[PDB]
Amino acid sequence: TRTRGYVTTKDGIKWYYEQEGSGPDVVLIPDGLGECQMFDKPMSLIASNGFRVTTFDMPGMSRSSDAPPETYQDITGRKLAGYIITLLDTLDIKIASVWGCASGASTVLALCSDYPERVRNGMPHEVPTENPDILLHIHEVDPATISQEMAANSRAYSGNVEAWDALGPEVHARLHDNYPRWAYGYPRTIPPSAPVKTEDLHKVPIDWTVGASTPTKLFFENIVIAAREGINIGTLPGNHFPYVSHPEEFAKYVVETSRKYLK
């Protein structure tokens, strides 16, 4: 029993969102591809443990594509956080345990830094601080090329190609269109704006993760930052999409981690 619906916020974004369960709030912010169907399985699992779980397609992406161009251009964690806060307000969510990978992780940190009152606890996964070589010129090519290149890269970082493929043609068709939009608005601006400064990290509890199979160099700096700052740091099975590759393990982490901070 999950709500699937739409809401147009004051910033003009026509959001597609989902919600399941009752209890303390948990918010699942997608990665840069902004496709919330990736959370379908773990959403129910988390919800079944006594939480109200909310997810949504990101601005300009997938079902939330009816949004103003600025909401998906020159993107930063802080920009996204603003939009999300507006969304939470309309959804009547006061405080939540928040998860997010990549740009979603950047968003989580922005939320913890600038909107601590709304965050129980934050769960960032693979915060981009330095892009790998595959993305260096992605914004410079045409859409068709972007979709071809990015569909491959994503599959390669999937952590489980079988599960990835298993998302289905509808999802993959949505992703096809998301790729160029993500490329033009995310990779150049997300990393330099990473909210990983000292003052961004200590207002609320944070449990940070990197993929177990992810090549060490990719998110190496996340590890060092966390360790030096005294922030809980660890790994999760898979790579960049633990929610897709390892839904069960992912759900257990969210539940167990969020549960620690409940009163």
Next chain:
Amino acid sequence: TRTRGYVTTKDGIKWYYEQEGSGPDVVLIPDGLGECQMFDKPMSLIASNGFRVTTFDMPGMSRSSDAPPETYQDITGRKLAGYIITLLDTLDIKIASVWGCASGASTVLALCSDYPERVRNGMPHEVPTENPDILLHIHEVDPATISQEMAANSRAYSGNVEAWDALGPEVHARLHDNYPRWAYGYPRTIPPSAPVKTEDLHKVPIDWTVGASTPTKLFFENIVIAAREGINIGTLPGNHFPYVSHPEEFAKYVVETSRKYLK
């Protein structure tokens, strides 16, 4: 010119060792396989930069096989350090910049902890603190099976299969015999004895590394420990054998790092 030969120390180890160059000492400790031909290329490079480089096959391994059984059983970093110290004494090496991967890294740390007076600076790479699942039962199967599995594992962790293969038939034939001996004496005892406590890490300069391409989880703890302790930590290209996969880059690292500490 490169010198190659044997020396029998007072602990009964008939060591196979090589040296090249003149200047401050650099010691290259092998990984668990104990095969020093792996350093051949970088050794020349390092030596050409004004250092006297020394390397050797490890006790019981390859050409250093004529050694007491005790020297290749229940191995720990401290145990290896003792043997190395005896060797350095015989070779009249008073102080050196020391490199080591895996069990070699454990040895480096042991040297930094217990024999700081002989270490100018330590360069540990991928210190085992927790074995991956592939090693869980390695000590329990037939020698042929060990050799087969470890040959595969090693190639998989090589960071460059072509360069790995290109070590040559002589080297691989030696490795084949080393695998079972390594299995019985190293993986069970090396990790628990890792000299990674606070008390082991501050006596002499340390520059710690992990492979860029190595799956994050494998040596994740190395990074956290180093960061927590205020020790220089970074990556090197490749995986578990940077000296084989990326000899130029490896040589550069050793030279630059060691040069920081000369006076």
